[model samples]
Target chain A: DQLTEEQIAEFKEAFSLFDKDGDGTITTKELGTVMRSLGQNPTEAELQDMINEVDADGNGTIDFPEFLTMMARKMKDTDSEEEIREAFRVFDKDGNGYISAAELRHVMTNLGEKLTDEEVDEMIREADIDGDGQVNYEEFVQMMT
Target chain B: DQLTEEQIAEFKEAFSLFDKDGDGTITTKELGTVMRSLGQNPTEAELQDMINEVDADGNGTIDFPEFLTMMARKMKDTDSEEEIREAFRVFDKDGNGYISAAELRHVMTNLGEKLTDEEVDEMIREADIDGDGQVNYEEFVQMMT
Candidate 1:
């Protein structure tokens, strides 16, 4: 899940564009402004939905980490391996070369779903191919691709 | 995050198209085949990645719930309220009128980011106008739009 330096730089640049006011965070209104600037006049509801999708903290705004994750997920629409890997990196929070069950649970919950303990255990069991109770980079790559 | 019945039906139909084996699940091979039929030849890696996304159970296949969640997330690309609602409902497990903090945390983690305790509290505070400490459907609607 290690994103190339270029990818990281690219995402940072994109984040800056949306982080108007230089506050290091992107608001729903800021996102709406950017979308409109991009020639897509998103409705208020649409903007809200978009913000909700990316605002992991439920703070009604998106920070750098959140922005990166959002971008990575969006990259899936394209057929790019590099983009896919970049997206995976956004989820591998600890940078430990693995996506732990706790990490998975964090993202899922923030996105609006609350997985039961059994379900979380099942997910880990299914993806932890080596019986190590963690999804290493290789397994993550396999799981994601 | 209540979806109209028709939306659910539409998604179910779409899921069936991918679940060609009629086994209520989709394998990586099946998805690759469908992509080919669509005139887009995806690589094995691409197919595996795609499956990994919807294969929430990590069994290297996609089930109905996973497919629905994936579809809902994809629907975010559109500006339609109906589509957004459909996506929201996918995470509103238990059919409760509220998306609890626990629910929010689960989804955020799964999506690839974890929020701080302060952020989660702020999210609920911003949306919980009634101060009941949870985001009810009305509050949820208000927060989004």
Candidate 2:
């Protein structure tokens, strides 16, 4: 999961709220209780937020809708495809090819760091495209490999 | 003061986290820790959210800013011109005058039951003007009054 342990814990706290009576499934009233705990008596905005994220249907109350969507979104382990592409493109600045030591350094420098030789070499190794110590555009692109 | 006992207790518990070493005043580290307890690590988004509401000088931190502003914004009043105006605008669908119990019922129907006659009347009384049995434009405006 992309979520860290802390996020996992918080997410569970939020989801476990649906499991009223200490059982695993959620009833409409139990879902209502959770919504109320969040300071919403299932207002449209609140209901939509839950439905869009946790509930799978447009029903007035959460039931199986909440369960299915919550579990699915929870099990999703990576960024959306567009997000992944955007992230790679960020490191692939200059657009000519794959990310190289210079490219990585450029991005990192903007974030407030001048790279040491060891650090740069380590980062290059981390992103190196081929077994060779050097990197070409193809190798760089493949490194995003 | 308008908060329930549990709300007040929750606020205090959220507050006491900053009183590390049992001291009332918070150091920057303590402040950071308190924020982290809220599942925030003072990221750009978190800092921006705080500064947007709490920062007086527009600097990055809440240092010397009114702590009460943060607390009050969170747990003090559910009533605000912005909130009421928005809520009222939604309820007063016709925009003709004050909200009738029917309008309130229509607005709340998606969530659950309509307010009881007594409840609606009480809300109307709280918002009504001239003590008229039914709400008029002037009376409705006076609700905001």
Candidate 3:
């Protein structure tokens, strides 16, 4: 494998996570569990698309060998500024470039962490460095990246 | 402080490194050690220059609180895509956008790593995923950020 020792450690942890039965393979049934664990919250069709698009065999069990590589790449992509900026677009929801209370309201409702309105406000407040009362791009960059 | 908890952890570790005796502060004397620890090799004058330029008070006693902001910014810069690309330029010393044996040779020589010719060759081999005998940007990116 091209993965380093540290990368190996991370992959093993992830594999161990979704491989609930610890049989060394993640079956189709266990896919949603891992998705939610990773905060992916994808629809069933999207999950199927991930399986079809990624797994080498598209068989019942995920193709562990190749699938791990995609997982690693996606993990690395999260470190890129371009990817970080696009994430702003995602959480920004309203496209105002300043993530507002509405976006945080929607997110807090969907997620199971069950954050209070004040908690979400605090999260947004932490990034509003200029005290402009809105999260600007530069402001959000510090929070996200 | 604009830094999050995780950022605080990183900066504290760095300060702890420079603070040597952990006397709740960093003196200007041990600055070079921290720089070298982070793979930075600057002249003594440059070390003094860094303290004068960055430490808020410019006193012999290096300002710990203010200095962390610089350290935090340095760490954050590494996460930027442009910074990653600019890093590629550094290792690809020839400006060919492809890191070859020569650049690795120079790097290995300057650092205390004490790499033999073959070890340097092996390092190149790891990143030259296409077996092209040279490390391109994409291939190097995998090895780097």
Taking chain B only, the TM-score of every model is 0.35, 0.31, 0.48
Candidate 3: regions farther than 4 A off: A1-145, B27-49, B54-61, B73-79, B82-97, B103-133
Q: Write the per-residue lDDT of candidate 1 for residues A1-145, one digit (tens) a residue.
A: 6557897786677668877688888764465554344333344555566576654444467677765554544333334456556656777777876765555654443233344557666656656544554576455455544
Candidate 2 residues A1-145, lDDT tens each?
3545664454345445444433445554355455444332234444445556644544434554444454444345334545545555655657654555455555554654354667666766776434342345454444443
Best by lDDT: 3
Cα lDDT tens digits for candidate 3, B57-100:
65666656756644554454344455666766877667767765
State the TM-score for model 1: 0.22
TM-scores for every candidate against the unseen true structure: 0.22, 0.22, 0.31
User: If candidate 1 were superposed on the true structure by all CA atoms, what would the RMSD be?
Assistant: 20.5
Query: Chain B, candidate 1: TM?
Result: 0.35
User: Where does candidate 2 clash, by residue pair?
Assistant: A142-A145
> What's the true lDDT of residue B56 in model 3?
62
lDDT of 2 by residue, B33-71 (tens): 554454332443444465555433442233322443454
**lDDT of model 3 at position A66:** 55
How good is the docking of model 2, by CAPRI class? incorrect
Error of 2 at A41 (Å): 25
RMSD of each: 20.5, 20.0, 21.0
For all candidates, the clash counts are 26, 1, 0
lDDT of 3: 0.60
